[PDB]
Ligand code: HEM
Ligand code: HEM
Ligand SMILES: CNCc1cc(C#N)cc(CCc2ccc3c(C)cc(N)nc3c2)c1
Ligand SMILES: CNCc1cc(C#N)cc(CCc2ccc3c(C)cc(N)nc3c2)c1
């Protein structure tokens with residue numbers, strides 16, 4: 001069964017066959033769509049089918065499907081599974097797995113770059129300190145003095161679920177958030193809870209509006225430990241506006257490296273619970289969400305005020321006006337400092353080209369419209385008029401509960 | 412299976428049970444979500460009756476006479492007429508209920524907080540295009556109300572054998588013409604290029620201006636459709652000017668005040684109203700973001716930004732964005748100045764969240780298509796963006812239907 005998607009701007013129609021190779025479920029049914037819902041201990045019983053499926057994919061990709069190399073590997077993995085209840089990936093497989101996980105990430109507008117991922121194998125890691133070291137090197141390598149590089153670092157796979165490696169931070173680099181007694185928040189409101197945990201674990205908070213948080217690292221199921229990323233590793237960009245001289249005085253800055261660390265990499269049934277990955281920012285991530293979202297730095301008011309906008313009725317679109325300027329300034333600041341950033345126009349255009357290419361060479365490209373469309377100026381980007389099929393392919397990045405809700409504390 | 416929806420800006424969590432009353436299909440499966448797909452032979456006597464019963468069961472529930480004398484009788488009454496006439500007719504009250512609830516159930520509509528204040532015009536006695544023209548003129552005049560817009564739907568006779576369909580061939584009652592130019596591109600309104608042709612190709616004399624109000628093309632009882640010109644005094648238009656940029660009026664833009672959609676099919680109790688033009692009032696972005704700035708439309712961003720002397724060299728200056736905002740500031744300012752009803756995308760989305768909360772509270776849910784509820788600009792700074800929404804199809808409903816010229820036994 002074949003499926004068509006249409007771009008209503010350009011009348012380009014594409015045909016998806018890839019969706020047939022889909023395994024996992026969407027949350028949707030015939031009678032309900034959960035397409036806008038944010039979120040919708042594994043035995044050998046179901047592991048080898050997952051392994052075989054991955055290995056079949058892998059050897060297809062290297063044009064060795066059915067080869068003796070393919071069959072022995074299957075045999076080898078089989079034997080290792082029933083013998084050890086799990087199995088290990090070769091380096092080639094791990095790299096393939098991680099790259100395809102990204103490629104399969106249907107909510108990611110950035111997947112044009114997916115084949116150019118730097119994979120760091122941290123599967124020999126055994127301690128938090130070792131994790132800290134691997135992560136430091138990730139950051140230094142990925143940051144590259146502002147010339148950002150995609151990278152992922154992969155810590156040991158889950159075994160019995162009782163010896164998990166986890167990075168407790170949601171991102172490697174993020175600013176603290178402090179609930180004040182008067183109800184106001186100092187720093188990033190998105191990070192208040194994690195900040196508290198860190199503090200409780202013994203972090204000494206400078207309590208400034210832009211304190212880089214400590215890494216909280218958990219190895220082999222042990223209680224997590226605190227580490228401070230060396231500040232010379234944390235590339236930061238002061239935020240100024242090209243026409244508005246008063247913008248710098250808003251005292252804003254942001255870090256250059258977006259590196260997500262709370263997700264789970266699944267490859268051939270194996271679960272990599274600590275697998276931090278990084279790329280570079282689309283400007284709107286910082287400029288729309290990180291600053292202007294009501295539950296974040298929320299500087300919309302202050303910028304509006306300083307622009308002397310009509311902030312009385314909303315129909316003055318003062319919010320819209322400030323939002324643009326703030327995103328103008330974010331892009332301006334980063335480019336001025338030669339730190340890699342992409343604007344939402346460029347990123348969405350690239351994605352459409354990626355997607356079309358993917359339909360031609362791969363038979364489809366799973367995509368989550370709700371997430372792919374930029375959080376501002378949606379319809380003047382070409383993804384807005386792009387119909388998209390959303391389905392779940394493995395290898396995949398998955399969500400997982402915050403470790404502090406599941407962790408058993410040693411003490 | 413009593414699903415929850417979270418608002419992530421507010422942690423408000425609503426419980427949805429209404430979805431279990433759903434009947435029709437979404438297009439999705441557990442293997443693939445189609446929620447971004449634009450759109451995924453009459454009724455036999457057999458499948459028509461449960462359809463009627465389902466609708467009548469809701470109706471009498473809503474008037475708290477479920478399982479009552481009145482209910483049972485009417486149920487029996489409709490049942491008899493179906494078996495006999497192979498169809499049936501709605502009581503006026505059921506018609507009104509049906510239409511209002513088709514709007515209530517329209518999961519893509521952000522304006523549904525107003526749903527129960529719909530003015531319903533029963534045009535089921537209509538027999539000719541001239542008749543349709545008259546009913547449509549009265550609709551347009553009533554809805555416009557000198558700029559104090561009012562919601563209305565006018566309902567023409569229900570489908571019979573599919574050979575006698577009532578159809579308004581226009582997509583909206585009021586839309587500007589679109590002309591293919593020898594120079595290459597398009598004058599007027601590009602979305603309406605083919606229709607503007609069909610009109611001419613059916614005998615219309617185009618003024619070939621940029622804002623030529625299209626003629627009505629009405630089809631009664633499945634006959635050759637007919638051209639009618641809407642009296643200009645009934646077509647309220649707003650000249651578009653900017654509150655701070657006096658050069659903006661020189662762009663020579665205007666829009667019409669009445670959004671009135673005329674190509675959809677209203678389904679009630681299994682009956683199919685293929686002609687049922689309905690209208691409300693605009694959210695500002697519908698004109699400013701979409702009608703002006705979409706590339707397959709007026710596409711005026713470029714020249715607007717030029718007059719703003721913005722750096723259009725690289726996309727990263729966000730000149731498109733900047734212009735887009737000014738254009739939309741202008742539209743609102745213009746309409747508001749001329750006392751024509753209009754809502755900004757902040758106001759409408761806020762309204763919708765309240766409406767959502769209301770529907771979960773008094774009805775147990777509210778079907779919603781996030782892809783369509785989120786405005787085409789400033790998405791994440793409107794409240795709907797962080798609002799999880801469940802999408803499912805309830806009846807009565809508005810549905811799509813083929814463009815008539817692809818079907819019509821001419
Ligand atoms: C290199 C440039 C990249 C850009 C510009 C980019 C951009 C984005 C954006 C804007 C989102 C939406 C999230 C949000 O707005 O909150 C997203 C989602 C995502 N990205 Fe990318 N990304 C990049 C690289 C990567 C890399 C290297 C990986 C993994 C190795 C990745 C994996 C993902 C995943 C798994 C999601 C889904 C998030 C979720 O499900 O919650 N991305 N990306
Ligand atoms: C009164 C103020 C109203 C406002 C502000 C409003 C707003 C909107 C908007 C913004 C859309 C999205 C379409 C787009 O942006 O391209 C929409 C869709 C829709 N509206 Fe409403 N609307 C209103 C009244 C009504 C009324 C009176 C009806 C019918 C009785 C109605 C039925 C619908 C339907 C069926 C759709 C989706 C049609 C489809 O699936 O394509 N609306 N509306
Ligand atoms: C404003 N939304 C905040 C947010 C929420 C979730 C969730 N759930 C997940 C994320 C992270 C999604 C993500 C993951 C990876 C990214 C990479 C590698 C690069 C980039 N520029 N953005 C990303 C964005 C953010
Ligand atoms: C430019 N948006 C694309 C679009 C496509 C189709 C189709 N096919 C149909 C529609 C109609 C959507 C609609 C329907 C009714 C509306 C009413 C009654 C009021 C209003 N302000 N907007 C509407 C908008 C839109």
Ligand SMILES: C[C@H](O)[C@H](O)[C@H]1CNc2nc(N)[nH]c(=O)c2N1
Pocket residue numbers: 008384385386387388447448449782783784785
């Ligand atoms: C391809 C995509 O689904 C299509 O462009 C939809 C997206 N969301 C929309 N949302 C609204 N309000 N109006 C639209 O026309 C559309 N078009």
Ligand SMILES: C[C@H](O)[C@H](O)[C@H]1CNc2nc(N)[nH]c(=O)c2N1
Pocket residue numbers: 035036037038370371372373375419796797798799800
């Ligand atoms: C409810 C909704 O799914 C949620 O707010 C999503 C919507 N789309 C998004 N899109 C992006 N890029 N990032 C997000 O965080 C979200 N949040």
Ligand SMILES: [Zn+2]
Pocket residue numbers: 028032033034035439443444445446
């Ligand atoms: Zn779906």
